[PDB]
């Protein structure tokens, strides 16, 4: 290791000491990747060891088993788990691979060459070498495109993935004919992020998801080849800052945006995050309560179409601002919710009256009651329900856990992006250590600010 | 002689000789903030009542409709709109736009853009002056808090009607309903935020009192002691050694801040990180993660519930919950 | 209370970001000696900025 | 009330404003 006297960095900024040490930076990276794969494998093995078959996954505090189940391993129709051995294999493979990654990281941190530039010119780099930076970026873009194509191959030829929109309550499906239309694919990226639009979170079918992944994989591979065979243009070279901290700040902004987006996916999307594995969304639970109290009073003989509440709008049914027949009450705010248990009941005008009178399925009723009782509301000591409910049930939704954690992570990584972008600009300009005290700019400026 | 039109415009925009710096963050900040200020003032003075709960039961909000400065507010958007982005051109008439809470979304969106560009503008001026850039990082904490109360909580709750009303009594209503539904007082992130504001007050008072205590004699009693400092003087105006010695003799000779830079870093970092934590607490309770639920945690040998202070708080929260939105709930669970 | 928390945060940030260089090294906390007779941050620059 | 609050507010504005203006104007005349 190094001290502050030879580096100018205190121990709490000691990782900055290896900004210009390619081999040690690579070792830190590989050890960190081993850490990520270690957590994946260990948490997966913990979840399978604590997994209980009769209860649904979202009642058991699981966040990785829903991911593998959405990939379509060990589950059947209705999201019912048939085998946990695929989950165990995923955990074991990750935990074993973490050992190899940890060995590589420890090696390159401790006894590997400090700088790769001399003996390994393929891996050696300086941060101002824009061509080598674009080469590394191109390699990683090719790898990411291959990962997206791995998802596509799993969806098309290797068993398919779980479709919650399959008739009868979802099942693992082979995706044939993915949506490769460019208008449909890039409409999502140019949609508004507000209600009724939802930007890319509102993707609602596996065909759209897999077609978008075909697009992402092909674009990532093409851009990777592009960056291997090109150098940044003069406009880019004037616009950007070319240093390791600046590149880190760009990545920090990108992953902050990704973390906020993942938060919104976990909270709103029920297609890529099926409710069978993740529990209902908030809108799903509110609409499920409305549907359950509709069907109960229908079974009690009440007319749910002419019943109006204290305000006069309608206790069970009302209208959206665009005229669609929707569930009444505060869940009117969730009138744009779409779920597999309610969309069979919707005709062109919205909630169809005769369908709500005669065409309600028992599986729809059971899912509605389950999702009403398992709303994503709970305390951080995992007491289910609103803040006034007593300590009876032990439940917090995985959607709630994911959304809260990933909003926090996105916010901190936005702050880190601000920190590193500012420090990269100041260090490139030459005043990251302070004002020179002999050539102070403000003293050379005209007064009155 | 650099006669180019865009070059001249850019030199004016990035000029440090303007009375107020504009910059490229300012060219977004100034129009959005002026729009938000104009709409907020006009709405606060003369806006018609807004059906906030979407139950055709409007809330007045404005001075011309019988509010004072305390009770006046710009009322949040209708619950029927939810998160659906209601601008003026999406309304059939200005009257409908006013009835449905459009001014609130206009002001909130423009205010969010303006404060993000205000943070960017702080960075930009620090860069143009040759300063270190992290005043923007410090300002990110109130920006996070405002974003949480105006945008993130409505996102997590499904409706801009759940945004904090742009007012004083509206702010109190937001706080009370928030405690009713989430038990924010029992949330550790809120406890960290309270510790941050209390500690910021403590440390501001402590630092100011120490610097004022160790001020060097440069004036007379008939003159204000502030006159002992001149703007741009090279030498220090107070005795850091004497202030540190007093502080060390006061509590502990160790656990001190004899490094002035370390002291000011502590003054910067404590309230900023705690406000970060409490803003994140608001953002997490947007997705219904809530404070500590200790209701009926203590039971005796026979299982009888021994009520605690948490249970008394729960009784208060029950009173808060059964009274908010007295006509808006048709079903027992407050899931929405 | 809120203005005092604001003042604490803003003054700490202003001092830490208007510092003079006063020594080579990216750790600025070692550029201050308690027995010194000059300011460690530029009040003129801080005033111009704010 | 409607008018006693009015005169209270007017006096609370004007009298301290008068005091401050007296002191400021004498100071500014003394530069």
């Amino acid at each position: 290791g190094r001290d502050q006297e030879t580096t100018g960095f205190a121990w709490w900024a000691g990782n900055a000491r290896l900004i210009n040490l390619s081999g040690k930076l690579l070792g830190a990276h590989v050890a960190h990747a081993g850490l990520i794969v270690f957590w994946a494998g260990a948490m997966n093995l913990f979840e399978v060891s604590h997994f209980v078959p009769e209860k649904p996954m979202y009642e058991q505090g699981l966040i990785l088993l829903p991911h593998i189940a959405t990939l379509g391993y060990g589950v059947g129709p209705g999201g019912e788990v048939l085998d946990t051995f695929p989950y165990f294999v995923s955990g074991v493979l990750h935990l074993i691979s973490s050992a190899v990654l940890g060995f590589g990281g420890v090696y390159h941190s401790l006894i590997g060459p400090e700088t790769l530039e001399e003996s390994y010119p393929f891996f050696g780099y300086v941060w101002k070498d824009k061509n080598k930076m674009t080469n590394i970026l191109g390699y990683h873009l090719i790898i990411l495109g291959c990962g997206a194509w791995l998802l596509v191959l799993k969806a098309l030829y290797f068993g398919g993935v779980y479709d919650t929109w399959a008739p009868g309550g979802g099942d693992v499906r082979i995706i044939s004919n993915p949506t490769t239309n460019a208008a449909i694919i890039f409409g999502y990226i140019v949609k508004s992020p507000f209600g009724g639009d939802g930007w890319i979170v509102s993707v609602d079918n596996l065909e759209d998801i897999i077609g978008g992944h075909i697009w992402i994989g092909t674009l990532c591979i093409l851009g990777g080849i592009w960056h291997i065979y090109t150098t940044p243009w003069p406009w880019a070279r004037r616009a950007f800052v070319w240093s390791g901290e600046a590149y880190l700040s760009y990545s920090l902004a990108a992953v902050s945006l990704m973390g906020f987006t993942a938060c919104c996916f976990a909270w709103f999307n029920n297609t890529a995050y099926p409710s069978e594995f993740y529990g209902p969304t908030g809108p799903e639970a509110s609409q499920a309560q409305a549907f359950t109290f509709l069907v109960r009073d229908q079974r009690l003989g009440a007319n749910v179409a002419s019943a109006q509440g204290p305000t006069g709008l309608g206790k069970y049914l009302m209208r959206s601002p665009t005229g669609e027949i929707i569930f009444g009450g505060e869940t009117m705010r969730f009138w744009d919710f779409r779920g597999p248990w309610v969309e069979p009941l919707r005709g062109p005008s919205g909630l169809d009256l005769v369908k709500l009178k005669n065409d309600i399925q028992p599986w729809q009723e059971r899912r509605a009651a389950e999702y009403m009782t398992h709303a994503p509301l709970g305390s951080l000591n995992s007491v289910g329900g609103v803040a006034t409910e007593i300590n009876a049930v032990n439940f917090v939704s995985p959607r709630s856990w994911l959304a809260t954690s990933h909003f926090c992570l996105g916010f901190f990584f936005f702050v880190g992006h601000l920190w590193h972008a500012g420090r990269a600009r100041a260090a490139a300009a030459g005043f990251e250590k302070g004002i020179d005290r002999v050539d102070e700019p403000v003293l050379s400026m005209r007064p009155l600010d | 002689e650099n006669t180019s039109l865009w070059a001249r415009f850019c030199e004016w925009i990035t000029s440090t000789e303007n009375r107020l710096y504009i910059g490229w963050f300012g060219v977004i900040m100034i129009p959005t903030l002026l729009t938000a200020i104009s709409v907020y003032i006009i709405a606060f003075i003369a806006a018609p009542p807004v059906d906030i709960d979407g139950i055709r039961e409007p809330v007045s909000g404005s001075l011309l409709y019988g509010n004072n400065i305390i009770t006046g507010a710009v009322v949040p958007t209708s619950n029927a709109i939810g998160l659906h982005f209601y601008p003026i051109w999406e309304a059939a008439s200005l009257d409908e736009w006013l009835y449905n809470g459009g001014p609130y979304q206009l002001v909130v969106c423009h205010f969010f853009l303006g404060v993000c560009c205000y943070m960017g503008r702080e960075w930009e001026l620090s860069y143009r002056l040759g300063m270190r850039p992290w005043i923007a990082v410090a300002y990110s904490a109130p920006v996070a808090a405002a974003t949480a109360v105006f945008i993130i909580y409505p996102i997590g709750q499904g409706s801009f009607s759940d945004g904090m009303p742009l007012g004083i009594s509206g702010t109190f209503n937001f706080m009370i309903v928030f405690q009713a539904e989430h038990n924010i007082l029992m949330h550790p992130f809120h406890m960290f935020g309270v510790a941050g504001v209390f500690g910021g007050s403590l440390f501001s008072a402590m630092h100011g009192s120490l610097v004022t205590s160790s001020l060097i004699r440069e004036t007379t009693e008939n003159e204000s002691a502030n006159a002992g400092y001149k703007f741009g003087q090279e030498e220090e105006t107070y005795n850091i050694v004497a202030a540190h010695g007093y502080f060390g003799r006061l509590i502990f000779q160790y656990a001190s801040f004899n490094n002035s830079r370390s002291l000011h870093f502590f003054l910067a970092v404590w309230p900023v990180v705690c406000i970060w934590l409490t803003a994140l607490g608001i953002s997490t309770m947007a997705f219904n993660l809530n404070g500590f639920n200790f209701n009926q945690s203590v039971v005796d040998s026979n299982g009888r519930v021994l009520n605690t202070w948490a249970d008394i708080i729960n009784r208060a929260n029950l009173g808060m919950e059964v009274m908010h939105e007295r006509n808006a709930h048709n079903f027992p669970l407050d899931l929405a | 209370v809120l203005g005092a928390a604001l003042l604490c945060a803003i003054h700490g940030a202003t001092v830490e970001n208007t510092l003079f260089e006063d020594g080579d090294g990216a750790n600025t906390f070692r550029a201050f000696n308690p027995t010194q007779a000059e300011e460690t941050y530029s009040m003129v620059t801080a005033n111009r900025f704010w | 009330v409607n008018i006693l609050g009015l005169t209270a507010t007017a006096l609370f504005i004007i009298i301290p404003t008068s005091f401050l203006l007296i002191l400021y104007v004498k100071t500014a005349a003394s530069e």
């Binding site: 007064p447 | 001075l63 703007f231 | - | 409607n2 507010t9």
Partner: peptide, 30 residues
């Protein structure tokens, strides 16, 4: 009547803000 007083007080505060910004005593480098 009371709305007149509230609006007057608010605009007077904003006028004080305007004057304190744009007609402040300039800090002197001396």
């Amino acid at each position: 009547m009371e709305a007149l007083v509230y609006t007057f007080l608010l605009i007077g505060t904003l006028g004080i803000i305007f004057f304190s910004i744009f007609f402040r005593e300039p800090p002197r480098i001396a």
